Amino acid sequence: EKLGDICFSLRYVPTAGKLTVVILEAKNLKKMDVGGLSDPYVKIHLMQNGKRLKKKKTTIKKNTLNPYYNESFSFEVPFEQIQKVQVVVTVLDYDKIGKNDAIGKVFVGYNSTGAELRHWSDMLANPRRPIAQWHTLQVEEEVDAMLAVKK
């Protein structure tokens, strides 16, 4: 089964050590609600080797598998640290308070691979320019495992 796709932009300003992630939209999200659709929001976790650092989240959209956000989030990551971090993006279905029901997950950073690594590398090769890219969502537990694999 397909979990969905997410589009976000990445921008790095090396002088200021400012990392900006804009959650743009998601599409083809898995239906999570019985009979219904999903109520998606997106968490953005800045991590280091799968260890928590800073956490942010989007607003919640109701009853949609194709949410449009255009919500920006910024993180302070000094130049010397930018190849040590992981930007972890999780789409969840809001259902009840305090309960996390993940639809799918992906991360970018130096220890990511494939199209995730490409997005990260394109960001670094284009300082100060926001680079937008689509990503296929994966199962949370599979992404969590990969966060622990260092290059």
Binding-site residues from annotation for Ca(2+): 33, 39, 93, 95, 101
For residues 54 to 93, the per-residue mask of contacts with Na ion, x marking binding by CB under 5 A and - elsewhere, is ----------------------------------------
For the CB of residue 31, give the shortest distance to Na ion in the complex, in Å. 24
**Pick from 62, 64, 87, 92: which is nearest to 77 by CA?**
87
d(CA 35, CA 14): 47
- Residue type at 136? T
**Which residue, 93 or 116, is less far from Na ion as judged by CB?**
116
Binding residues for Na ion restricted to 18-47, rule: CB under 5 A: none
Please give the structure tokens belonging to residue 133: 């890219």
Cβ closest to Na ion, residue 98 vs residue 114: 114
Least Cα distance to 57 among 109, 16, 103, 21 occurs for 21
The least distance separating Na ion from the CB of residue 130, rounded to whole angstroms, comes to: 21
Q: Which is nearer to Na ion, 38 or 91 (CB)?
A: 91
State the Cα–Cα distance between residues 89 and 148, nearest whole angstrom. Answer: 16
Q: Considering the rule CB under 5 A, would residue 140 count as an interface residue with Na ion? A: no
User: Is residue 134 within 8 Å of 40, Cβ to Cβ?
Assistant: no
Which positions from 96 to 135 touch Na ion by CB under 5 A, shown as an x/- string? -----------------xx-x-------------------
Between 71 and 122, CB nearer to Na ion: 122
Task: Give residues in contact with Na ion (CB under 5 A).
Answer: 113-114, 116
